[PDB]
């Protein structure tokens, strides 16, 4: 439905939707911009990720409230209340899966294959790992292992490039490590790997801070603080 709008007007309207906190609209404008077929700039990649993060984050928070109520309904001595809680948790789960499939489809057609620079390729592979991770949070069937493996493979290819091509303070590298460590802790049942990766990533960034300008140091230390927040929570 965005095929008739100019690329620059979609970008302009995505920024207005972010100011208005209309994240569903922001995501549909950025999806229209990606489907123009040109590569994204750094600013444009961050608009795409902020839009879908916020849409899927609302769906994930609603799914967790519904899954909690359904788990309680399934405890001994709870009354039978019919199929409605499961049906509505399914409805929200299917719309969240559809948003993840939309993002994964943009990455596969054709953002990753045209991304040659480390900043773009690592960013898109982190997004691929993140949206397979959100699929894995709701997966309960025969494909669950393969969805977890798809998240792990995308994060591992992004880690391999980031280690070779970016400094240890780069904010995309740090946020990748942060999210891969949460994948290990919450999805792969590997809390020791999660804690090792967060510790190593924090320590290697600390040793590289002396190379930075004041503004770069603020960007990097913001994400380092997220890694230390998870280490505090997990240890």
């Amino acid at each position: 439905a965005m095929g008739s709008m100019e690329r620059a007007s979609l970008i302009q309207k995505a920024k207005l939707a972010e100011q208005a906190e209309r994240y569903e609209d922001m995501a549909a404008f950025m999806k229209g911009a990606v489907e123009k077929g040109e590569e994204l700039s750094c600013e444009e990649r961050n608009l795409l990720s902020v839009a879908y993060k916020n849409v899927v984050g609302g769906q994930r928070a609603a799914w967790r409230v519904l899954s909690s109520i359904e788990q309680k309904s399934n405890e001994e001595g709870s009354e039978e209340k019919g199929p409605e809680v499961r049906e509505y948790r399914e409805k929200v789960e299917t719309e969240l899966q559809g948003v993840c499939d939309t993002v994964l489809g943009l990455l596969d057609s054709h953002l990753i294959k045209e991304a040659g620079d480390a900043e773009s390729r690592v960013f898109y592979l982190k997004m691929k790992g993140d949206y397979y991770r959100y699929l894995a949070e709701v997966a309960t069937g025969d494909d669950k292992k393969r969805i977890i493996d798809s998240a792990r493979s995308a994060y591992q290819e992004a880690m391999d490039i980031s280690k070779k091509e970016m400094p240890p303070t780069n904010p995309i590298r740090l946020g990748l490590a942060l999210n891969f460590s949460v994948f290990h802790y919450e999805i792969a049942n590997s809390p020791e790997e999660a804690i090792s990766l967060a510790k190593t990533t924090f320590d290697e960034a600390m040793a590289d801070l002396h190379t930075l300008s004041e503004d770069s140091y603020k960007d990097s230390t913001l994400i380092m603080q997220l890694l230390r927040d998870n280490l505090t929570l997990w240890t």
Binding site: L178, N179, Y185, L227, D229, L233
Partner: peptide, 6 residues
């Protein structure tokens, strides 16, 4: 406190 992601 929920764990952080970005």
């Amino acid at each position: 406190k929920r764990r952080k992601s970005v």
